[PDB]
Amino acid sequence: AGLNYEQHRFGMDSLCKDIFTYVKQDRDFNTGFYLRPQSESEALRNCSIYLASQVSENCQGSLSKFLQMLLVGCGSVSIFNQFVTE
Amino acid sequence: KIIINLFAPNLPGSTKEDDLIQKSLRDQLVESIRNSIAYRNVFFVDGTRGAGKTTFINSVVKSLNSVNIKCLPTIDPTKLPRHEPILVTVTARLNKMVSDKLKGYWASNDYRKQKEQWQNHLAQLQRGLHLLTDKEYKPEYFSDALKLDAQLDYSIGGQDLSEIFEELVKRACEILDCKAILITFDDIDTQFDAGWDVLESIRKFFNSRKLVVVATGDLRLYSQLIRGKQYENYSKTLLEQEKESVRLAERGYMVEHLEQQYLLKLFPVQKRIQLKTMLQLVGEKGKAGKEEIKVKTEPGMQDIDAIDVRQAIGDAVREGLNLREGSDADMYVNELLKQPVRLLMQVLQDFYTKKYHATSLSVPNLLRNALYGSMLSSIYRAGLNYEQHRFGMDSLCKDIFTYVKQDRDFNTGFYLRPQSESEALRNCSIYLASQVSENCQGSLSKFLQMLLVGCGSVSIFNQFVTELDREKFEQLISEYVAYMSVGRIESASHWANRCCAVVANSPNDEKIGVFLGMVQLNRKSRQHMPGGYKKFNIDTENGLAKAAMASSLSTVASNNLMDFCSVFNLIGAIADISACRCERSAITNAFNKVIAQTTCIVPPWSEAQDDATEFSDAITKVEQWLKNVNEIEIGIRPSALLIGKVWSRFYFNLNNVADQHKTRLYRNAEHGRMASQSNAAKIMRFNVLAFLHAVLVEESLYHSVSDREYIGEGLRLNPVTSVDEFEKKIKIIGEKLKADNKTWKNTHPLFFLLISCPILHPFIFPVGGINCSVKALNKETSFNKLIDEIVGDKLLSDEEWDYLTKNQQIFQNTITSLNSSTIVGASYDKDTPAR
Amino acid sequence: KIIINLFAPNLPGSTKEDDLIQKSLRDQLVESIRNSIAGRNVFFVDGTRGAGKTTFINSVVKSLNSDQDDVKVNIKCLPTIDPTKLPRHEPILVTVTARLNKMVSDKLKGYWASNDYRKQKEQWQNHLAQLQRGLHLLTDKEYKPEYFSDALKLDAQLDYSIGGQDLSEIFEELVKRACEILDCKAILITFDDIDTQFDAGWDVLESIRKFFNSRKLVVVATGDLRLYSQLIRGKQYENYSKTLLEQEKESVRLAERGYMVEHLEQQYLLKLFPVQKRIQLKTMLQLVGEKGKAGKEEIKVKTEPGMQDIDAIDVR
Amino acid sequence: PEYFSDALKLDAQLDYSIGGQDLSEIFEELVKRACEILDCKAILITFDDIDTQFDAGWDVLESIRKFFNSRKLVVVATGDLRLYSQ
Amino acid sequence: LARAENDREKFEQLISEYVAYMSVGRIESASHWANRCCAVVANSPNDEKIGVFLGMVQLNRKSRQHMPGGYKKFNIDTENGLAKAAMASSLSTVASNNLMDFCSVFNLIGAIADISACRCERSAITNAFNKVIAQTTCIVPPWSEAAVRAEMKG
RNA sequence: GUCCAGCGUCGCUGGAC
Ligand SMILES: Nc1ncnc2c1ncn2[C@@H]1O[C@H](COP(=O)(O)OP(=O)(O)OP(=O)(O)O)[C@@H](O)[C@H]1O
């Protein structure tokens, strides 16, 4: 699928890039950031579960990491769809 | 009598005399062969692919081997080596036949002379066989060519392989003591590149009167074989140069004349035999068939009990597709009979084998498995889905769209009739119809999804999108499929919200806010409203009216937020609620699933009172309703046609309502009593009557559990403005069911469940949308009484019903604010005409 | 009941344990073969979604090695690893003789010398040498006149009904002789995937319908039909006259030729792999069923080392 | 065709799993003998990139998927996937 | 509807529809053919929109708003014995956007064609006569623009 | 004839009386 696949070097830096490089291939800017397994490609359906698990691990037990996911991870996708895409 | 056993090998090598389908033709051909030798002498058994040609020939050969003719072993040029001349193989078969005869003579006083006569003839053929092998002319054989033969004294000099083989057969016949020899060629269907060598050998070598040939194959293939070989006699330099239209037109004619003349000289037309198909043998419908055919569906079935081949497919189709007996069901079985017998036999041999194993059910599951395997090739060429494990509601809703697109008939292509002229699109309709009747059987939530998603997407696109040419067509097609996201939807309610955006963008005349089933209310207050007209607000409604009105709200964001009141949303909520009964909180998550949790953008192609237990009663009624649904819906048998017809009526009904109300708003439409004045409550009232009306008529006529229609004679219309058309039919149905000792639940399960739905009841009787006149109340009161009887509980009390008809109370079951709402683009300046 | 122990003693990969997952399907298919053997016996096992089709087939092969009607089974032959110019007729023939040769060499242990031992071995060598001579007419490109003498040459033994070489019959006698020697009822052949080498399928499809049509032979082929359909359709255009293709291309004959080629392939697939014989592998969802429904057989999973089977929890 | 009689001269040596003149099984026993003689657990085969002339890379791939599949052989290939895919 | 020289597949397809619709080659009944012929010729009105046609004339089922003199609707019940029998053998109805009535002369020829092939006794004459005079409806042709509405209302 | 109602783009058609 083209996402990050290094065994280490996991953090806030790569997760936001992975989310935006997944919706771009899924062509779903409306509700694509829920990371749901509804897709026509077996590669993409396998990536949806992996991505969802990574989110719950990173922003667990902290407040700032949660707020970063709300803004950077999901805000960028929704902002792009309404304004830039036109 | 002909009886076919399904639990048998059913192969050309394991068929007996009582199993053949063309027994009449076999006797006709055998007599003709005997007559020809008793008084170009070649036959041709015409038959399309998979019509059972080898099986027929084997019967002909075996019957003649039971006026004395010796039959050679059957020869098919496909299995032969790619470079072996036919004359080599045929003379090899003769060698085995005569040698076995000579050995039986044991010691022979005078037949030893015959043996050396045979050996010399075979050696003579061997010397001259190099003519068919040489790639270059070799002149040192010329002295050998000028060798006079002292025996049989050939009139014509030279090798002349034609005259040598004519002698060879003549000596063979006397050894075997017969008067004819039969050479049987099988089909060249698989590899017709090597069928040319057979044709040349027949034309140039088998010309004697002691040889009779029975060819086998289909003529259309032979036409393309010969016509292709007639183009290679031209000089390529000539075809390369004279490439103008006039010369090409004349040259093509010449090849056709030479090609046709070739077949007449090879296979005379008076000898041709055409293999009848299955439809011709059993006739059409009740017409007396020329022959009767019976099968054995269960193992061990005796000969005395056996069902007709028309009935054998008749019950399978009428049960697998959940389609009622009639002309519509007879259209499918007539088509299945036209398929080649190999394909037809494989479908039957799979369905009845699996079904008996299950019995040792879900019959439609058995039919879909059989058709998918048999008609797999047509699936691939049509571009349909072919993933077995991905079968479900989502895949089926996309296959319908990708089929009608190739059918180029958006108006009525979702009926899945087998009417397309393309063979692939005719083998896919029977397959798809088996898909709908399987996934949709036994559930109401799945049924409503098909009626909305499966057929709604097709009709909406054809009216509001295609009016916007090859490059643009798939451009809109690609844009529309992804934007509304068919095949990956999340819920019917979310789909309906996306449906609001598509309809709204396209402008209409007078710019009135009324649309196809949706009313565009107002968000910003406008000054100087006559009467009590004011902005719509959701706070006024208290109980079930507040919940029901909430289920019919959708917001679209395009330079300005817009509010509609769509009937499509109600179908979504009903489809969403009845999904499961596992949890109680599910039936309150559906009310507020989309109301204020998401926003929809304009499509790209556009040109530009404790306040905590308020829902304690509405949830309670809905919870009790799900008890009835979970029991009645088990006996539901929807069809691929029933869903198609209900949408056709429902779609037509909505389009009429939206046109006969754009001009009936005026200034004093509030408290609308006269039929000439309408408000936002009447418009939304008929949009839910129309949905209920279409279910009533079409379910009665086409649904499987009802054996005979109950509507009766007379025209069937729709309630565009009045209500008496809808109440008229219920009264007729009420009497007929009562007189026949029957109940609604056992004949109209789809209508009974929908009419007794807590969500729709507030919309049926809005406050401001009830006709009032001297004659109207006769229809309304009778209609109100009839509905309360079907459900079993009266919806409205005496004081409630009195206030609706006649000129303050806490209405827990009716909308009180819609009639006073203001619709955008409706500039109230006119007045109601008086008459 | 089905129990899977995650804490297997050796901690193997994939935790196969016992009974696998398709024990119901495996016994069903094996029962189906025995019925037929007691013309066309082609079984198609569809391995897709990256399934372990080879693992399932080998389970069938191993199961048939302990059989009441003891229909012995050959070894799997992948068409993508054989030499390119070696016909697919040879691997079965080599596999048959190798399997047969061990048994007759093992007859020495049972019987140091016997009448059947001396006669069967020399009879078998006669059949093979018979096939080698006729093997010349497979890869040859031009019919030399010398082979005519052999075709007219007659053998009083081996009971060759149809005259000529007729390589189909020569193989049939060899198979019939082998079954009697090994004391079996049928010889089973398995064909693996063709995914790695696309074109290897055609030389197998034309070998099933030419030499493997017999009463005492059963085959089990795997793969997917998307490649097979494209393989058959490709070979149905190569017999059209090359000149005709550039001449009659007036946009009407293109439709006629396209409609006819799709007809020939459809009748081709139904001839080799019948619908009634095609088998499909159940998935986990279809085997445990949807939640709230009993569905098919239930499955239990262990979660801790030394966990009693009385407490194993459902897989869902 | 004359090699048909050359084969079928079956030998019990090495107890081959399958009959025939397959090179893969013969090469495998060749490696096993060499490992015993050299007293090494396994043999490592190292290839090199094919950037200069990538037509020769096909013969490498065929000889890896057919003849190098034992547990005594480790293969280390070098190249560029963007070139191997073409 | 479909030009002969502009297109061939469209014209050839239109032939197939006409062969099936008129039931040519099946010949269920001569009267059946006559009823179908009414639908074909009533599809295309003339410029003046008069109710007269090739061989038929379009009668009125519902009386119009007002009448000048003695003009009125049909009221078939007025006719006496033999005249009613001839009348009913000529009346026909077509299932279209709205129900329509005709008085086609081809129906009269159809009636003669059905009776004249009897070769029976008096008992079968009474039945065959009764079968000729009845009410028969025929749907509009597929190529018409009112097919979908007629299928629903009818 | 009257009244309600339904199709078509005033015409046509259905029901009650
Ligand atoms: N007389 C028959 N009795 C029973 N089944 C029959 C009969 N004829 C045909 N069939 C069915 O139809 C199939 C047609 O097979 P058949 O090989 O005869 O057809 P074909 O297309 O002419 O092929 P071939 O290339 O062998 O000539 C049979 O396999 C069988 O299923």
10 Å Cβ neighbour count for B807? 6
- Nearest Cα to Cα of residue B577 among B492, B519, B512: B492
Query: Alpha carbon of D21 to those of C192, D13, E87: distances in Å?
Result: 19, 14, 95
Residue C57 to residue C50: CA distance in whole angstroms: 15
* Protein CB footprint (7 Å) on chain F nucleotides: 1-8, 11-15
- Amino acid at position B368, single letter: R
- Check: CB of residue A72 under 8 Å from CB of residue A32: no
Give the DSSP H or E segment for B686. helix B680-702
Residue E106 to residue E90: CA distance in whole angstroms: 8
10 Å Cβ neighbour count for C77? 20
Angle, vertex CA B375, rays to CA B371 and CA B379, nearest 5: 115
The single-letter DSSP state of residue E52 is B
Residue D54 to residue D79: CA distance in whole angstroms: 10
Residue B584 to residue B498: CA distance in whole angstroms: 28
Query: Alpha carbon of B795 to those of B542, B626, B673, B809, D80: distances in Å?
Result: 17, 18, 21, 16, 76
3-state secondary structure of D44: strand
Q: Do E148 and B421 touch (CB under 8 A)?
A: no
- Check: CB of residue C262 under 8 Å from CB of residue B222: no
- Check: CB of residue B704 under 8 Å from CB of residue B637: yes
Say which nucleotide is closest to residue E149, CA to C1' distance.
F7
A38 touches chain B (CB under 8 A): yes
SS (H, E, C) chain C: CEEECCCCCCCCHHHCCCCCCCHHHHHHHHHHHHHHHCCCCEEEEECCCCCCHHHHHHHHHHHHCCCCCCCCECCCECCCCCCCCCCCHHHHHHHHHHHHHHHHHHHHHHCCCCHHHHHHHHHHHHHHHHHHHHHHHCCCCCCCCCHHHHHHCCCCCCCCCCCCCCHHHHHHHHHHHHHHHHCCCCEEEEECCCCCCHHHHHHHHHHHHHHCCCCCEEEEEEECHHHHHHHHHHHHHCCCCHHHHHHCCCCCHHHHHHHHHHHHHHHHHHHHCCHHHCEECCCHHHHHCCCCCCCCCCEEECCCCCCCHHHCEECC
B712 touches chain E (CB under 8 A): no
| B622 CB-near residues (< 8 Å, 6+ apart) | B577, B587, B758, B759
Give the DSSP H or E segment for E62. none
Please report the sign of the dihedral spanned by the C-alpha atoms of residue D11, residue D13, residue D15, residue D20: negative
3-state secondary structure of B831: coil
Residue B20 to residue B667: CA distance in whole angstroms: 81
- Check: CB of residue E150 under 8 Å from CB of residue E96: yes
- Report the protein residue whose CA lies nearest the C1' of nucleotide F2: E65
> Which of B2, B44, B296, B342 for mutating ligand 1's site (highest number of atoms within 8 Å of CB)?
B342
Please report the sign of the dihedral spanned by the C-alpha atoms of residue B337, residue B339, residue B342, residue B347: negative
Q: Which two tokens stand for residue C1?
A: 């009941």
Q: Which two tokens stand for residue B89?
A: 């193989």
| CA distance to partner chain C, nearest, from residue D52 (Å) | 26
| Helix spans in B231-340 (H) | 236-241, 245-266, 278-282, 309-320, 327-338
**Atom 21 in ligand 1: residue holding the nearest Cα:** B50
Edge-to-edge strands of the sheet including B211-217? Answer: B70-71, B181-184, B211-217, B42-46, B272-274
Q: How close are the terminal C-alpha atoms of chain B, in Å?
A: 77
Residue C27 to residue B390: CA distance in whole angstroms: 26
Beta bridge partners of C191: C77, C221
What is the residue whose two structure tokens read 């006496």?
E80
What is the residue whose two structure tokens read 């065929």?
D62
Q: Resolution of this entry in Å? A: 3.8
Largest CA distance in chain D: 47
Contacts of B600 in chain A (CB under 8 A): 30
Query: Alpha carbon of E40 to those of B274, B580, E23, E96, E138: distances in Å?
Result: 37, 54, 13, 12, 11
Four-point Cα dihedral B774, B780, B784, B789, nearest 10? 90
Residue B349 to residue E34: CA distance in whole angstroms: 46
Say which nucleotide is closest to residue B776, CA to C1' distance.
F4
Residue C230 to residue C233: CA distance in whole angstroms: 5
- Amino acid at position C12, single letter: P
Of the CA atoms within 13 Å of residue B769, those in its CB half-sphere come to 31
Looking at the CA of residue B189, tell me the nearest atom of ligand 1: 25
The single-letter DSSP state of residue B594 is S
The partner residue sitting opposite A82, judged by closest CB among B394, B487, B601, is B601
Residue D85 to residue B245: CA distance in whole angstroms: 46
- Check: CB of residue C281 under 8 Å from CB of residue C46: yes
| Helix spans in B106-218 (H) | 111-127, 142-145, 161-176, 195-205
Say which nucleotide is closest to residue E65, CA to C1' distance.
F1
The partner residue sitting opposite E153, judged by closest CB among B412, B648, B715, is B715
Residue E8 to residue E2: CA distance in whole angstroms: 9
- Check: CB of residue B79 under 8 Å from CB of residue B95: no
> Is ligand 1 within 6 A of the CB of residue B187?
yes
φ and ψ at C70, to 5 degrees?
35, 55
Q: Which two tokens stand for residue B184?
A: 């049987």
Query: Alpha carbon of B98 to those of B89, B103, B129, B747: distances in Å?
Result: 15, 9, 21, 76
Contacts of C99 in chain D (CB under 8 A): 19
DSSP secondary structure, B507-550, as one string: --GGG-SB-SSEEEB-SS--S--STT-----SSS--SHHHHHHH
> Is ligand 1 within 6 A of the CB of residue B397?
no
- Nearest Cα to Cα of residue B529 among B675, B665, B674: B665
- Check: CB of residue B323 under 8 Å from CB of residue B704: yes
- Check: CB of residue C272 under 8 Å from CB of residue C228: no
> Is ligand 1 within 6 A of the CB of residue B725?
no
Residue D29 to residue D35: CA distance in whole angstroms: 10
Residues 374 to 403 of B: which have CB under 8 A from any E CB?
Answer: none
- Check: CB of residue B784 under 8 Å from CB of residue B731: no
Q: Do A38 and B601 touch (CB under 8 A)?
A: no
3-state secondary structure of B385: coil
Angle, vertex CA B799, rays to CA B793 and CA B804, nearest 5: 90
Question: Strand C217-223 and strand C42-46: pairing?
Answer: parallel
> Is ligand 1 within 6 A of the CB of residue B77?
no
- Check: CB of residue B673 under 8 Å from CB of residue B773: yes
Q: Which two tokens stand for residue A25?
A: 């291939």
The single-letter DSSP state of residue B129 is G
- Amino acid at position B359, single letter: T
User: How many angstroms is C1' of F15 away from CA of B235?
Assistant: 81
Q: Do C229 and B377 touch (CB under 8 A)?
A: yes
Q: Do B490 and A82 touch (CB under 8 A)?
A: no
> Is ligand 1 within 6 A of the CB of residue B55?
yes
Ligand 1 centre from B50 Cα, in Å? 7
- Amino acid at position B64, single letter: L
- Nearest Cα to Cα of residue C146 among E103, B88, B712, B344: B88
Residue D21 to residue E48: CA distance in whole angstroms: 93
Residue E110 to residue E132: CA distance in whole angstroms: 9
- Amino acid at position E63, single letter: S
Residue B782 to residue B777: CA distance in whole angstroms: 8
Residue B675 to residue B686: CA distance in whole angstroms: 13
Chain B and chain A touch, per 3+ beta carbon pairs within 8 A:
yes
- Check: CB of residue B212 under 8 Å from CB of residue B38: no
Residue D14 to residue B44: CA distance in whole angstroms: 60
Q: Do A31 and B598 touch (CB under 8 A)?
A: yes
Largest CA distance in chain B: 131
Residue B549 to residue B657: CA distance in whole angstroms: 20
B705 burial via Cβ count (<10 Å: 0-12, 13-18, 19+): middle
Residue C53 to residue C34: CA distance in whole angstroms: 21
Residue D11 to residue D29: CA distance in whole angstroms: 14
Residue B770 to residue C300: CA distance in whole angstroms: 61
Edge-to-edge strands of the sheet including C313-314? Answer: C2-4, C299-301, C313-314
C217 burial via Cβ count (<10 Å: 0-12, 13-18, 19+): buried
- Check: CB of residue B244 under 8 Å from CB of residue C256: no
Residue B810 to residue B545: CA distance in whole angstroms: 11
- Check: CB of residue C181 under 8 Å from CB of residue C105: no
Residue A34 to residue A38: CA distance in whole angstroms: 11
Strand ranges in E40-95 using DSSP code E only, listed in sequence order: 58-59, 92-95
Residue B444 to residue B753: CA distance in whole angstroms: 9
Residue D61 to residue D69: CA distance in whole angstroms: 12
> Cβ of B718 < 7 Å from strand F?
yes
φ and ψ at B824, to 5 degrees?
-65, 150
Residue B596 to residue B585: CA distance in whole angstroms: 18
- Nearest Cα to Cα of residue E109 among E26, E38, E50, E44: E38
Residue B784 to residue B303: CA distance in whole angstroms: 59
Residue B400 to residue B386: CA distance in whole angstroms: 14
Of the CA atoms within 13 Å of residue B107, those in its CB half-sphere come to 1
Q: Which two tokens stand for residue B53?
A: 């040609």
Q: Which two tokens stand for residue E61?
A: 């089922």
Beta bridge partners of D44: D74
| C5 CB-near residues (< 8 Å, 6+ apart) | C15, C17, C302
User: How many angstroms is C1' of F12 away from CA of E62?
Assistant: 9
DSSP secondary structure, A1-55, as one string: ------SS--SHHHHHHHHHHHHHHHT--SSGGG--S--S-HHHHHHHHHHHHHH
| B111 CB-near residues (< 8 Å, 6+ apart) | B102, B105
- Report the protein residue whose CA lies nearest the C1' of nucleotide F3: B775
- Nearest Cα to Cα of residue E53 among E69, E42, E37: E42
Question: Strand D43-46 and strand C313-314: pairing?
Answer: unpaired
- Amino acid at position B602, single letter: V
10 Å Cβ neighbour count for B296? 20
- Check: CB of residue B45 under 8 Å from CB of residue C259: no
- Nearest Cα to Cα of residue C207 among C217, C186, C182: C217
The partner residue sitting opposite B488, judged by closest CB among A38, A81, A82, is A38
φ and ψ at B605, to 5 degrees?
-75, 0
Beta bridge partners of E102: E58, E92
φ and ψ at B45, to 5 degrees?
-90, 90
Q: Which two tokens stand for residue B428?
A: 């896919």
Q: Which two tokens stand for residue C270?
A: 């139904």
3-state secondary structure of B600: strand
> Is ligand 1 within 6 A of the CB of residue B280?
no
φ and ψ at B267, to 5 degrees?
-110, 100
- Check: CB of residue B4 under 8 Å from CB of residue B296: yes
> Cβ of B719 < 7 Å from strand F?
yes
> Cβ of E66 < 7 Å from strand F?
yes
- Nearest Cα to Cα of residue B748 among B810, B800, B702: B702
> Is ligand 1 within 6 A of the CB of residue B11?
yes
